[PDB]
């Protein structure tokens, strides 16, 4: 089980993938004044990330997948497992991971059962509560998911070009800081990203082209956003806070 201790190990030389199935089975809700609640499914995705390279395999799950089926929440886990298994098998042997870490425990059994052909690939849960669900608050990802007309695999680098300049650990920390902030207060986090109109997002990137200098200030604003909202939900003074585990706040 991965936690904030053996967390470093992520950045060694063994290829690993995180799998988040949070956005696989997604709905909008209609609630009448009576209390009757109807759901409608919208397009979803499996978020499969290599935290070392930033390569994102985004497998889009079209609503047609649910047509005529029952026990959709259970089904969704088994479908995620088949897709991840299929992905691993499509890769050259030297690119296959040695570990796959699932962000939600309920994914453990389905995935381990589908991966039985690979006894040397460890399937692991985690005690971190990573903010990957907020991936749909990234415009370009939300857009490709919503415009999909059938299942489709799309490939991104979620670190853009950062790894020309920073280590994987620094990049992963920037990424989870950004997603945590987007998860916590989406409009405010996006305002921080859009503040300077002269800084743009390249057509092949997901994030603005900040300079090294600017990233320091952006990261610090995101950090403030998080700790402020955390100090509203529970009325704790962050002044009275120690450095504590602000990092545990960021990670889960």
């Amino acid at each position: 089980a991965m936690n904030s201790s053996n967390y470093a190990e992520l950045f060694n030389n063994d290829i690993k993938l995180f799998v988040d199935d949070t956005n696989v089975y997604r709905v909008t809700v209609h609630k009448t004044f009576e209390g009757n609640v109807a759901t409608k499914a919208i397009n979803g995705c499996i978020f499969t990330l290599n935290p070392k390279t930033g390569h994102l395999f985004l497998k889009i799950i079209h609503t047609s997948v649910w047509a005529g089926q029952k026990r959709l929440s259970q089904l969704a886990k088994w479908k995620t497992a088949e897709e991840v298994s299929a992905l691993v098998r499509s890769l050259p042997k030297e690119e296959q991971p040695k570990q796959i870490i699932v962000t939600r425990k309920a994914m453990l059994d389905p995935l381990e059962v589908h991966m039985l052909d690979f006894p040397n690939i460890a399937i692991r849960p985690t005690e971190l509560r990573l903010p990957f669900s907020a991936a749909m608050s990234i415009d370009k990802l939300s857009d490709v998911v919503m415009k999909a007309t059938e299942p489709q695999m799309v490939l991104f680098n979620i670190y853009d070009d950062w790894l020309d300049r920073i280590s994987s650990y620094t990049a992963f920390s920037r990424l989870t800081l950004l997603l945590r902030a987007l998860k916590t207060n989406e409009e405010s986090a996006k305002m921080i990203l859009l503040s300077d109109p002269t800084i743009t997002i390249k057509s092949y990137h997901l994030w603005p082209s900040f300079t090294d200098e600017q990233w320091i200030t952006i990261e610090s604003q995101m950090r403030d956003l998080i700790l402020t909202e955390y100090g509203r939900k529970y009325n704790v003074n962050i002044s009275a806070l120690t450095q504590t585990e602000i990092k545990d706040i960021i990670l889960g």
Binding site: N185, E187, S188, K190, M191, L194
Partner: protein
């Protein structure tokens, strides 16, 4: 400065996010009371052209369904020249749209506007605005207020009582800081449904310009304006800036 204009326009591009969570003020259904049906496409665009701080408003027009005279379907939103404030809006008179084609059978239903405070009744400024617009023309007109806030929009429809029409014309004054004898009871609950099964459209000023906020001197609240079918411009569109150099 062209700078500060730019930041406000940026914030407005995130307004659409608020449509993810939609709340509608509702109570136990009353059969004899009218039901107003608002096309979702109209709410979506109207939020998209609005502002994060300044109130935006428009008239609503439509008509009874064929079987049911109690079901008033909103067909058309009319954006008219106006000057918005935090907390209030100076709206120009009921527009003359009868000369436009495809408006046969259209009934004036009332008005719709955003606000940045949450309330369970028409505020004092709504009462004055609603009085000035409707007291002498059509007192059964409704007010749909959209409380717009990060994360969500909350809609409430109101009718205005005769008592309310009366206070609103006594206190027609633009300051409106006295508010002596203002009552929440001046307004009553109207029944409102959101629907994405019907589509509505927009009528706009013929020269595109509806937001006179940065062209205050050029705004005539009594003006007799020209109207056409169209796609309404956003609050900080360049056409809503004073043309310069």
């Amino acid at each position: 400065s062209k700078n500060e204009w730019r930041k406000s326009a940026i914030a407005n591009t995130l307004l659409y996010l608020r449509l993810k969570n939609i709340y509608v003020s509702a109570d136990d259904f009353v059969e004899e009371q009218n039901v107003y049906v608002l096309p979702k496409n109209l709410l979506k665009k109207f939020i998209e052209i609005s502002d994060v701080k300044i109130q935006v408003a428009a008239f609503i027009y439509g008509m009874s369904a064929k079987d049911h005279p109690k079901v008033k379907e909103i067909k058309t939103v009319v954006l008219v020249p106006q000057l918005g404030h935090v907390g209030s809006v100076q709206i120009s008179n009921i527009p003359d749209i009868g000369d436009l084609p495809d408006t046969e059978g259209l009934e004036l239903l009332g008005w719709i506007h955003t606000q940045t405070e949450e309330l369970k009744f028409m505020a004092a400024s709504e009462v004055a605005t609603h009085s000035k617009l409707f007291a002498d023309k059509k007192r059964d007109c409704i007010d749909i207020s959209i409380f717009s806030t990060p994360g969500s929009v909350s809609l409430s429809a109101y009718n205005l009582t005769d008592e309310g029409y009366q206070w609103g014309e006594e206190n027609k004054d633009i300051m409106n800081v006295l508010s002596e004898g203002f009552e929440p009871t001046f307004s009553t609950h109207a029944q409102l449904l959101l629907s994405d099964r019907i589509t509505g459209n927009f009528i706009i000023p013929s020269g595109n310009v509806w937001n006179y906020t940065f062209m205050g001197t050029a705004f005539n609240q009594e003006g007799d304006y020209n109207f056409k079918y169209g796609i309404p411009l956003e609050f900080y569109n360049e056409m809503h800036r004073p043309v310069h150099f």
